[PDB]
Design a protein that fits this description.
- Two copies of one chain form a homodimer.
- Chain A is built from 28 helices and 26 strands.
- By secondary structure, chain A is of the alpha+beta class.
- In chain A, the strands form five sheets. Chain A has a seven-stranded mixed beta sheet with strand order 1-9-8-7-6-4-5, sandwiched between helices. In chain A, strands 14-15-16-19-18-17 form a six-stranded antiparallel β-barrel.
- In chain A, helix 5 packs antiparallel against helix 18.
- The structure holds sodium ion (NA) (4 copies).
- It is classed as metal binding protein.
Chain lengths: 958, 961
């Protein structure tokens, strides 16, 4: 019999999806006001009012209260109508959710006092609160908060966010690395601490005891963290040097004052120290490098493996490169809960690598970016043999059962080793359920924070409260943020039975979502859904597909659309459910589609089209949308090949795609403990499926190769005519570049405006072959009258594929054109080598070359490259609605192209790639100029998906 | 007849000193809850409850609600008993005050939605709010918010505070400075934009048109801000280059990627660019330089003038140095409302200097640090000829008149020119009455923000909301902060009649305070109070003192303790009041004291003692205090000589002090519009005066030179005895270093433990002269018994002054000792050359020198300097309760001192300085070693003010009702 007590216990923490808890909130707000009144009365009770009743009933006062009331109601109305409804379980996109009422109430209660934690005398109470919050976080993460033991004493503080926490960690690591060189300078002959240099020793990285003055620069750049952090205490213990003197003397030698590059230059050092970090690291990492004057070039990114974890062998190889080149390493970043997939780097392996490299003389700090993952350490098991008190029974079985579940074994292993990192970022305003702003940084050894200053630690005195706000980036800071986090910690509980219970219910919800992503699509649905984390039987890439399909059907029969109670009573179902989806509650998955004969799409850009449209249906990305009409919210990301390498390749492989392009995926962050109530998740799954099916129909129309109607520009005169197809990427059947010489049978003859031919009988472009013919219709620009015509005697000058698989990824430096026609009557058409691109054609041109070109070359079609048109530098071209063509446009009447002329090295008709990157190495036929005269066609929309309607607009037009 | 309307209008904006407006707040909170419910019901109305009634009445749910209620009441009770009561007008110390209810309500209303302004799709509404707030601030500050005009389009955003806003402004200035070098690299031969290099020109700093590729590195380092910001648009307009291509290509050349120092080395550049900023700038400036890898050494500090304004002539001299040495200047910081004094730098003169140096080829961005001063631009006059609608009358005269007053002319001039700075920092959570966290940064030309990125501006599209959170230091950020500022702006009003009214009332209150600081003390009070901003008749340092006293008496007769109505009806009184105190609401002042014969103290450290104790009485600096017992709150600061130079000198001069030491001053930030009601300001003045008189009594006791009882260590044996006075700085009468040879008449003979003599009849140390005598009592260590003795045949071996004026400011590198006695029986006593210090004496020692020293030299007393005791490195010595003496202590039995020996170049007795800094250049008598044997005395508390009780502890020991 399943108990509802654990879900009921956390249901009281939130206002609720339907504001079910509003009466409790009203009571708590009334208490806040009463207490405020009591406290302001208690401060000098004999003071009379400054705001009298006669003042309060005057017209100006009343006018101000009416303005406040009106502005307030207008803000509340607009917030409800225009914000994302994170409070609803329909939202499961980013790291957003209904926040905990204890946090909101802590912040509100404290803002009436508006304490400023930059200084004790402005925050005598909330400075102590914030210090206690830092130590709560530290202990929860496994650091030591006890004084006078053998372990280092941790310290923690609140910052505006994990971005500033990561910046501070990198700043401390920057200053740490150079401290021993600064101290060596400060103790050089002639300097203020020369008197220590003949006796002051350190342990070098490999453990040898040497005088600081006898260490090589490399040795000084590789002292262990503890070796460096111990130096001020050691100087005091061993020479009775005061912290005041030490700080004063060191001011002129530390990089806070001189910057690291002046110090390096004096020391003859040329290798910039680096930070090592996974290729997919949060933006705050390269940004901190740029801010700190390290430079993002010196944030060296470590490739990831197929599950997006930092590749340990690659980290090994890059640490070896640093050792061999004497490039110091400030810091290695372990991402504990990646932003995009919720994965956990193997910090156990990073720690092993540190031991390995310290034996070779290379040392570095380790930082755990646990901005997202940190709070999941509350799910680590804790010794229960310490509790012996009566426990109120858990015997409720009211409707409203939601179980918690536990961490995956690997996640628990890494979470229990983050306590060995030298510092840890963790965001209460991510998985702590505290509203923004509330980030946090904890140091394993709190003395590290003094590196962020020009100061040395003093002995604290009881008669002077210590300011906790001078050890970071910021200045003024809200003590209210500390009260908020503190209220969350004390009310929810930093234990398995508190936060562990809440996050375990979110994790059960996450796995229930993942079951749907993992089994929704079949062999015959129009769509496929592929989870980023394969189901157990699917992990092996050579698995028996029968076993994979069997496990998917097991999911359909035993998990999907069942109640929590039925599932929890099914041991096998729970064991399987335990293994589905993200390590830490961030499911990634992606859709593909099949045509109507059930053939899977393999084009990465068409899968991207589909997945981006699904995202658009399930998100708000413009002010035009009514967000209350979105029934379900996801996020989305692009796995760039260059950052996700083998991982992005494997995602594409399992989706059934072929190609090197970056792949778009969907992201489903799960923080809600409510979604599985009454199997609401199933409803969401069904909603998702319905929308996917709609978008797949569009995809199928987009990619249908049935015969259809095509458009062609006409070039030439009665002497000889050419047709130039107007390609498009909006239809798979239009993704061809085609130029033909033809005869035109009909009554057309007019010697400004485009002449356009459509085929009247539907046809496939690929069926146009030498000798063919077809009937058509002419349309002189906007003229209402039309002309019937017969296209005969077709000769294919060019027929190339504009399919993804046949295009290039890099634009040409100089713009290439097909150059075709007859002597004295040539024509131009921009070669489409990449999309997005721009169609450029010129029917009437004047060419002059240093060598006359033969009729054979002109008929076969040459390639001319414009030395004065730098195509790549202009890409992508603005959409037609966003730029005006004038005579200054580079492709307009009167413009002159200076060109080199080449023979086309590929056959007339080809469905294979035609790379032209090195066309400049082909034999040059001749060179000269081309002046554009007329019959010019310019279209930057047809070859660019950005001109298409969004899924929001299409859905609104139904 | 004065109107109460303007004060009534702003009284409704705050919960109130006594929470008078709690019923209004209760109503508004009820509305917040009601609307949250209506909103969550409106999103998919057919969704049923997830939290049912049966869940809400279950025992686990009820237990969680009881825990919430219990934690909430505990937090509220503790906040009320343990926080500073900023809500009361009794508080007037730092930039803290009761915050506006519209702001608190905007933040609360929005946190239920918890929007994240890092990305539009997480904040489709509050991103727009934050952009609108940025443009509101920009327009208020005088920037342009209109599109499609000739003026640049400003942009602003909210940051966690002014520290991060200053950091972003300096980061933007750093990347701006190097952009043209990066673009030159990106268009070099072989590079991706080589094709522009033969046609792409810029205007150099002096205005000549040159190809970018033909500029010298110095010329590229001095292009104007607008020249640089125009480059992406120009490349697009002139070569049709796309922003995508430009961004991608430039990533490898910009210092975001390479850092400035690798770029500089590739260009052969050796002068670090600098930031120029006043010597008194907020800590956020040197910290930003340190963060950004510029280094605080390259934040060059500009000295201030006697009113703490950046000295414009000194800035001129420093810019000339930069020009001559080809040191680029990132940025010049004009502080508009200094943190310590509320002063306004003359940015008009800085703009003139910019014109001067641009004509010479030196250019720099200008940043206005208006973190505090910015909101005072709402008090600038505005054209009212645009308003023609009916105005509800201002005819209320109920009790509660508080007038607003206007800016000083100089403040208005500078505030109206900050719109010419390239960027402006301003804090809603300082003078905006918005709770923390809410700082802000505005760019005159919003395109500058793209320097904080690897991006180039794209053309916006309607179907995609633009994220406003990728242009700064931070990541996730609360849309709630933007709602808070937005509500405060809409409700209070960014106009002279809105914020201008509120701040004008605070400024009237500030001047009412300043009147007390300016006239409270007389010729015969035991204390003096000296304002940092002199009264008009006192500005001239050679003014007729009759005129100064006449104006102080005018203030006493016409302003102090009068009602607002009487003062406002007194034109002459208002004209004078207008000129008192700070420029922008931060009064600085400091106290001094007189002895009981009415002689003014001139000792800077005794004035500091007094002002620090007064501060303690009016502040909470420890967790032991009950903050609700403090009746008035001030802040305090130290004007360091090295930073405030002539300004600190002039403060000390006008207090009557003589000396080069740093001076402590008191600081009175005024943000309350309520303090003048019922002349509550007067009550506070009297409270202040009472406490000052209390502390002056302590100062008088501390500095009374009347005869008293003194302590002496006894050195030597029956052969010859010496007395070594145990000096103290806790009493002026103990501030002498004294060594005497004496005869001891009595029944004393004890051969580990200290032998101590006090005089039994009070005496003055300065009257001890050769031949004198006095009765005394011996005390063998821990012995309960005492011994009558007669000290006779006194010979003064050393008598030196330990008064502030006769001590040195820098500690000796090597420790000096007096070395005296007879051959084979010498003694040591650490020379006290600076305080704080440590008393070190050794009665029994063993010396060995390379030359035997004569009995005359030993009797007169030599100076031995210990090569192996580095005195400066150990100072200040920990207090006695904080360290335990062991045999490892450098001054303990068995320690060997390796010393040089010198003759004392000063007379036995002297009340003048005895500098020993360069003792090493005196002729060396001999050298050798001294081994400490016994009779050792060590005391680190007697010569250190840190061992004294605080003013809070003394006051706690005085009984009261
Ligand atoms: Na949408
Ligand atoms: Na192909
Ligand atoms: Na106090
Ligand atoms: Na003297």
């Amino acid at each position: 019999v399943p108990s509802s007590d654990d879900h009921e216990r956390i249901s009281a923490l939130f206002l609720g999806p339907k504001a079910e808890n509003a009466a409790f909130l009203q009571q708590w707000l009334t208490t806040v006001v009463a207490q405020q009144k009591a406290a302001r009365d208690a401060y000098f009770p004999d003071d009379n009012a400054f705001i009298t009743t006669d003042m309060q009933t005057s017209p100006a006062f009343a006018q101000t209260t009416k303005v406040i009331a009106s502005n307030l109601t207008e803000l509340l109305t607009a917030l409800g109508e225009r914000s994302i409804p994170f409070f609803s379980p329909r939202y499961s996109g980013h790291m957003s959710v209904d926040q905990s009422l204890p946090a909101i109430l802590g912040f509100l209660s404290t803002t009436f006092y508006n304490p400023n934690n930059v200084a004790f005398e402005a925050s005598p109470f909330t400075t102590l609160i914030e210090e206690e919050v830092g130590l709560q976080l530290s202990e929860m993460l496994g650091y030591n908060r006890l004084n006078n033991t053998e372990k280092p004493l941790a310290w923690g503080h609140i910052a505006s966010g994990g971005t500033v926490a990561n910046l501070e960690a990198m700043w401390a690591a920057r200053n740490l690395k150079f401290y021993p060189l600064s101290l060596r300078d400060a103790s050089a002959e002639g300097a203020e601490m020369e008197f220590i240099r003949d006796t002051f020793s350190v342990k070098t990285c490999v453990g040898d005891k040497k005088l600081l003055k006898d260490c090589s620069p490399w040795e000084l750049l590789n002292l262990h963290v503890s070796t460096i952090l111990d130096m001020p205490d050691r100087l005091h213990d061993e020479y009775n040097i005061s912290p005041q003197f030490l700080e004063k003397v060191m001011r002129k030698y530390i990089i806070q004052s001189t910057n690291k590059d002046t110090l390096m230059q004096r020391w003859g050092l040329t290798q910039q120290p680096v930070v090592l970090s996974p290729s997919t690291n949060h933006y705050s990492w390269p940004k901190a490098a740029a801010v700190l004057g390290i430079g993002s070039d010196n944030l060296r990114n470590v490739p990831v493996d197929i599950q997006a974890h930092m590749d340990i062998n690659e980290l090994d190889r890059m640490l070896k490169i640093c050792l061999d080149e004497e490039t110091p390493v400030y810091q290695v970043v372990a991402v504990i809960g990646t932003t995009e997939e919720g994965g956990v780097d193997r910090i156990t392996e990073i720690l092993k690598l540190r031991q390995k490299y310290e034996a070779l003389g290379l040392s570095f700090a380790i930082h755990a970016d646990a901005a997202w993952g940190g709070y999941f350490a509350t799910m680590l098991p804790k010794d229960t043999l310490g509790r012996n008190r009566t426990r109120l029974p858990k015997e409720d079985t009211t409707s409203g059962f939601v179980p918690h579940v536990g961490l995956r074994e690997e996640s628990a292993l890494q979470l229990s080793h983050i306590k060995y990192a030298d510092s840890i970022t963790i965001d209460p305003h991510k998985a702590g359920y505290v509203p923004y702003p509330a980030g946090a940084l904890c140091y394993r050894d709190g003395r590290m924070r003094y590196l962020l200053t020009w100061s040395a630690p003093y002995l604290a005195q009881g008669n002077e409260g210590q300011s906790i706000g001078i050890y970071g980036i910021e200045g003024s800071k809200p003590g209210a943020a500390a009260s908020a986090v503190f209220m969350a910690h004390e009310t929810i509980g930093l234990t398995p039975s508190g936060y562990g219970n809440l996050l375990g219910q979110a994790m059960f919800t996450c796995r229930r979502y993942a079951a749907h992503w993992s089994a929704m699509s079949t062999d015959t649905t129009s769509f496929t859904v592929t989870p980023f984390n394969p189901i157990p039987a699917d992990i092996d890439p050579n698995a028996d597909p029968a076993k994979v399909e069997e496990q998917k059907q097991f999911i359909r029969d035993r998990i999907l659309f069942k109640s929590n109670e039925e599932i929890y009573n099914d041991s096998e179902a729970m064991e399987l459910l335990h293994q589905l989806g993200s390590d830490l509650n961030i499911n990634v998955f992606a859709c593909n589609f099949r045509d109507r004969d059930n053939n899977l799409n393999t084009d990465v850009e068409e899968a991207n089209w589909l997945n981006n449209r699904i995202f658009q249906r399930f998100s708000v990305t413009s002010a035009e949308e009514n967000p209350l009409e979105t029934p379900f919210f996801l996020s989305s990301t692009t796995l760039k090949q260059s950052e996700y390498g083998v991982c992005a390749t494997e995602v594409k492989r399992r989706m059934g795609l072929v190609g090197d392009q970056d792949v778009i995926v969907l992201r489903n962050v799960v923080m809600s403990p409510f979604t599985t109530t009454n199997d609401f998740v199933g409803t969401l799954a069904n909603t998702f499926q319905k929308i996917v099916e709609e978008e797949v129909e569009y995809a199928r129309i987009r990619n249908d190769m049935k015969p259809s109607i095509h458009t062609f520009l006409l070039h030439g005169s009665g002497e000889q005519y050419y047709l130039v197809h107007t390609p498009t990427i909006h239809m798979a059947s239009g993704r061809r570049q085609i130029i033909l010489s033809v005869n035109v049978e009909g009554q057309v003859r007019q010697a400004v405006e485009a002449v356009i031919v459509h085929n009247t009988v539907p046809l496939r472009l690929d069926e146009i072959v030498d000798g063919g013919s077809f009937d058509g219709i002419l349309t002189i620009g906007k003229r209402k009258t039309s002309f019937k015509v017969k296209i005969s005697n077709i000769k294919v000058v060019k027929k190339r594929s504009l399919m993804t698989e046949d295009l290039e990824s890099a634009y040409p430096s100089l713009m290439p054109f097909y150059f075709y026609g007859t002597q004295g009557h040539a024509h131009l058409d921009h070669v489409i080598t990449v999309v997005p691109n721009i169609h450029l054609s010129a029917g009437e041109i004047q060419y002059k070359f240093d060598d006359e070109v033969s009729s054979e070359d002109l008929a076969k079609g040459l390639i001319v490259v414009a030395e004065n048109v730098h195509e790549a530098s202009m890409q992508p071209f603005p959409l037609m609605k966003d730029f005006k063509i004038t005579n200054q446009f580079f492709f307009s009447s009167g413009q002159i192209l200076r060109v080199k002329v080449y023979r086309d090295p590929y056959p007339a008709s080809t469905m294979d790639p035609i790379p032209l990157h090195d066309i400049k190495n082909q034999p040059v036929v001749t060179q000269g100029t081309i002046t554009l005269v007329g019959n010019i066609y310019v279209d930057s929309d047809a070859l660019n998906v950005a001109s298409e309607p969004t899924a929001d607009e299409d859905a609104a037009h139904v």
